[PDB]
Amino acid sequence: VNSFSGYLKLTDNVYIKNADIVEEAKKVKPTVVVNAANVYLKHGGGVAGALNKATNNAMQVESDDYIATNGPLKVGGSCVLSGHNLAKHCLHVVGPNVNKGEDIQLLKSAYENFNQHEVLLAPLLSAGIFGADPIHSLRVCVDTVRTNVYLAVFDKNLYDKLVSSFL
Numbered sequence: 001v002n003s004f005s006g007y008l009k010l011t012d013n014v015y016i017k018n019a020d021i022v023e024e025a026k027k028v029k030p031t032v033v034v035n036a037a038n039v040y041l042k043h044g045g046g047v048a049g050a051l052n053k054a055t056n057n058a059m060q061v062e063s064d065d066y067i068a069t070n071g072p073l074k075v076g077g078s079c080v081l082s083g084h085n086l087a088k089h090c091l092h093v094v095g096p097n098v099n100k101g102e103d104i105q106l107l108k109s110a111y112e113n114f115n116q117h118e119v120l121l122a123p124l125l126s127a128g129i130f131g132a133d134p135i136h137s138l139r140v141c142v143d144t145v146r147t148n149v150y151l152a153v154f155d156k157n158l159y160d161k162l163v164s165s166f167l
């Protein structure tokens with residue numbers, strides 16, 4: 001039993017809700033919140049911009065030190081950093097950005113990072129400003145993640161379309 005509330009159950013391990021991931025994280029304080037990161041951990045907009053803003057830019061400060069030490073992530077890769085005031089940890093995961101021409105096949109590799117954590121609060125990878133089809137992203141999530149994932153979909157219309165179109 002965990003403290004996630006109001007989710008619809010899609011499969012044995014995947015759950016979904018129309019919610020703002022920032023507000024969900026502040027309420028639940030999950031062990032792991034997933035960020036929709038880019039390889040430079042430049043948290044400018046979308047999910048990343050919103051999560052970073054909620055940390056008063058502390059996420060960006062920590063991320064800049066990480067990059068200065070380690071260099072950029074790989075598309076499809078991840079790193080674990082602090083969750084600041086939102087969660088114990090933040091798993092920064094880089095899905096492919098279609099608006100940059102990146103290979104959508106890397107979306108499965110991106111979701112594989114979730115399997116290293118027993119329970120996660122997460123957005124749909126490569127959705128939103130990353131340009132991929134969110135229905136496809138949900139299909140990849142369900143077919144790749146085996147650990148318990150609680151998906152927050154900000155847009156009510158998309159959520160309804162995601163639920164209503166789920167096979």
Ligand SMILES: C[C@H]1CC[C@@H](C(=O)O)CN1C(=O)c1ccc2c(c1)OCC(=O)N2
Pocket residue numbers: 020021022036045046047048050123124126127128129152153154155156158
């Ligand atoms: C992954 C993408 C595309 C699908 C969106 C959806 O789930 O409807 C969620 N996404 C966001 O980038 C996004 C999420 C939360 C916030 C935000 C942007 O900005 C303002 C804010 O306070 N929160």
